[PDB]
Amino acid sequence: MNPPPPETSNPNKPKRQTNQLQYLLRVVLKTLWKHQFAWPFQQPVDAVKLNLPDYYKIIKTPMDMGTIKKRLENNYYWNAQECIQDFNTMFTNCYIYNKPGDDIVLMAEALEKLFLQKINELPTEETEIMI
Amino acid sequence: SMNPPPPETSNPNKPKRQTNQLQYLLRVVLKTLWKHQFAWPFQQPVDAVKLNLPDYYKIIKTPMDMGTIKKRLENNYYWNAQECIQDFNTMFTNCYIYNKPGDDIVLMAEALEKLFLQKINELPTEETEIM
Ligand SMILES: Cc1sc2c(c1C)C(c1ccc(Cl)cc1)=N[C@@H](CC(=O)NCCCCCCCCCCNC(=O)C[C@@H]1N=C(c3ccc(Cl)cc3)c3c(sc(C)c3C)-n3c(C)nnc31)c1nnc(C)n1-2
């Protein structure tokens, strides 16, 4: 069965906005979201609809771009690294559950390569921006 | 790279009609299939653009899906139940034509088709017109 989706807010988690996080939403997320291979990653894995009864036994930290997008929009993150970590979790979850050469893995790899290209242009200094 | 217009779901020039088994196909068959775990790929037309399938509509010239069937039933588009049963069969057949025997989507379609056959075996025995 599917767990609830990852939180996109938390009253106990400090919120923040930075120049780097703005970039992650406006440039990085936007570019990946519109990519040909984006669709399977735009919402949580539905293990019932995909008949993957072991998915959430193997994947203990699920993540998807819909969640990341909403976290950025909601100022859920404290810094850019927290967001970058979520992207990395999304990619590695796919590699962990699946096998090399699988179509979905090839898709994840292409998105990850694009991701790395785009964050190479991340502003080098973190500047906090008042919400 | 481009999707075709969806199948027709209503037409003034067409004689609108309703029967008891057509009502059953909507209220029982369509309803039950829609809620199946593997209904999702069949709930709307195949989106060849999103799925990157430039050959899908080269191969499939009579596409059909449950979203279209739902609309046809609602709009009283069919003349009788056999016209509707034919659309379900076309939907399944398209999947088996485009994909390979061991493919995940084919296994999904086969499970959905098994349920379809079970439900239509309980169709009202005599087709009677409803005004
Ligand atoms: C909305 C529709 S309509 C429709 C389709 C879809 C998605 C499908 C289809 C439907 C369901 C599935 Cl499981 C696979 C394909 N195939 C096309 C034909 C097609 O696209 N052929 C191209 C080759 C497809 C190769 C499919 C390999 C399937 C492997 C299944 C086992 N592995 C998994 O379930 C892991 C899962 N794997 C996938 C995945 C695998 C391959 C591809 Cl190309 C995309 C996503 C996946 C997600 S989330 C999510 C919503 C999906 C479909 N994912 C993430 C994230 N991480 N792992 C995954 C088709 N033909 N007739 C109909 C109807 N369809």
UniProtKB/Swiss-Prot annotation, chain B:
Tree of life domain: Eukaryota
Site features described as Acetylated histone binding, chain residue numbers: 99
Annotated Bromo domain residues: 17-123
Oligomer and partners: Interacts with p53/TP53; the interaction is direct. Interacts (via CTD region) with CDK9 and CCNT1, acting as an associated component of P-TEFb complex. Interacts with RELA (when acetylated at 'Lys-310'). Interacts (via NET domain) with NSD3, CHD4, BICRA and ATAD5. The interaction with BICRA bridges BRD4 to the GBAF complex. Interacts (via NET domain) with JMJD6 (via JmjC and N-terminal domains); the interaction is stronger in presence of ssRNA and recruits JMJD6 on distal enhancers. Interacts with NSD3. Interacts with NIPBL.
Pathology noted in the entry: Cornelia de Lange syndrome 6: A form of Cornelia de Lange syndrome, a clinically heterogeneous developmental disorder associated with malformations affecting multiple systems. It is characterized by facial dysmorphisms, abnormal hands and feet, growth delay, cognitive retardation, hirsutism, gastroesophageal dysfunction and cardiac, ophthalmologic and genitourinary anomalies. CDLS6 inheritance is autosomal dominant.
Family: Belongs to the BET family.
Extra facts: JQ1, a thieno-triazolo-1,4-diazepine derivative, and I-BET, a benzodiazepine derivative, have been tested on tumors with success. Treatment with GSK1210151A (I-BET151, a I-BET derivative) has strong effets on mixed lineage leukemia and promotes myeloid differentiation and leukemia stem-cell depletion.
Swiss-Prot/TrEMBL domain comment: The NET domain mediates interaction with a number of chromatin proteins involved in transcription regulation (NSD3, JMJD6, CHD4, GLTSCR1 and ATAD5).
Entry protein name: Bromodomain-containing protein 4
Organism of origin: Homo sapiens
Protein encoded by which gene: BRD4
